[PDB]
Write a protein that binds this ligand. Sequence first.
Ligand SMILES: CC(=O)N[C@H]1[C@@H](OP(=O)(O)OP(=O)(O)OC[C@H]2O[C@@H](n3ccc(=O)[nH]c3=O)[C@H](O)[C@@H]2O)O[C@H](CO)[C@@H](O)[C@@H]1O
Length: 322
Amino acid sequence: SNPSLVIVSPALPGANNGNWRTAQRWKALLSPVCSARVVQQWPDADASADTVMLALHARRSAESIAHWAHAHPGRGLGVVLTGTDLYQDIGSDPQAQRSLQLAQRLVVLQALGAEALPPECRAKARVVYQSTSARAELPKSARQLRAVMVGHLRQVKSPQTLFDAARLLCGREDIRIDHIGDAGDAGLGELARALASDCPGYRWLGALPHAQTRQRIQRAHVLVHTSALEGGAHVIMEAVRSGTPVLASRVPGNVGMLGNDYAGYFPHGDAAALAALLEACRAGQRAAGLLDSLRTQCALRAPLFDPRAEQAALFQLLNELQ
Ligand SMILES: CC(=O)N[C@H]1[C@@H](OP(=O)(O)OP(=O)(O)OC[C@H]2O[C@@H](n3ccc(=O)[nH]c3=O)[C@H](O)[C@@H]2O)O[C@H](CO)[C@@H](O)[C@@H]1O
């Protein structure tokens, strides 16, 4: 019969974040060829019928990955490198390192991912670009530039780069920055609140439901993403597949999503560089404007994030694991 797949996600069930989104999307995409379930840890009371595991995060799921590898030595294990593992933990973390060794297949979420893996792990590495539904590209007003950034506030999102750019632009009534995401890591929420009180063109909206967040991404002239690292960020896909161009920090996770030739990168942590891009976007608002050049480049990336493509890549992965 068809495989019994268990997806391990460290997200809380129903959480509005990437780790929950991937796991629930992979379950939907794989459902026509297998019996699929999502858990936070393995084993559980239903563990005896599972034949394949896809485990997100080499460190956060290392305990379930180890359980699987001990119960199924050399068979049925895929480890998904969701970001903070690939670009932080696998360097020094012995649990992350063991997960890498035990996996039958490693999944990276964009083309550059395997460059961060040990060379001995590259033969068993598999690229699975993520997917999102498209939204109609909307005509937008030339009267103002409205940027949006989306990420639950934590240090890896480097939200200070956005706060520092919003400060450089404090006086520009013709440039608006909306920031969507909960106040997680200590004091980042306080920084956003203080900035919003000083610089009215900057608004921190807190966490928003995914529906409303996709509507905000679709309506913004540009999405800004400042991260220190990303596995391959859902928010960048969401923008691209809405016809909303991106300004992103030049880090491998972002480069993997937007392309080596993309004209909308700033150096990581360079607030002045990001504020200069926002000024260019605004100056451009006929054709030849930076926003138009970036929408052209993003439109060439949009077919990467087709759910039919992700599904075909997952079908191949599952065939390799059973
Ligand atoms: C730092 C890092 O490596 N991040 C990874 C993390 O996702 P992480 O959760 O950090 O970030 P993503 O951008 O990929 O996912 C956030 C998701 O939550 C939604 N959202 C967020 C905040 C908010 O207030 N409202 C809202 O709806 C966004 O629209 C998006 O769908 O795991 C994902 C895979 O599992 C990877 O794709 C990401 O690269």
